[PDB]
Amino acid sequence: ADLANGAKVFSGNCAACHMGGGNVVMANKTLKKEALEQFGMYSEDAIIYQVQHGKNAMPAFAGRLTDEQIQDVAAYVLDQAAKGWA
């Protein structure tokens, strides 16, 4: 997908809580590869579903982000997780 648009969606909607791929709200639910894989979330469609619907203290973005923005940011997250979030 568009990784330039994902990074920008992410800086605008996700980084308050996940800067650097971590998680200041629930410290074990990070965006690193091994963590996503432990929970069955290392997939484009798992991330899209959770971005759209929310989960516990993760807000829902259905209706605040377009389908394209959500697709982009899911792709960005997966790209970064692959690279270790350097």
Ligand code: HEC
């Ligand atoms: C804080 C207010 C957050 C914002 C803004 C976003 N997310 Fe988040 N995320 C948050 C929590 C509390 C959790 C855990 C929820 C639970 O109880 O299970 C998460 C989880 C995720 C995950 C899965 C992480 C994992 O299983 O290891 C992903 C993939 C994720 N969040 C991505 C994400 C994106 C792309 C966001 C912007 C659109 C975003 N989050 C916002 C907290 C918060």
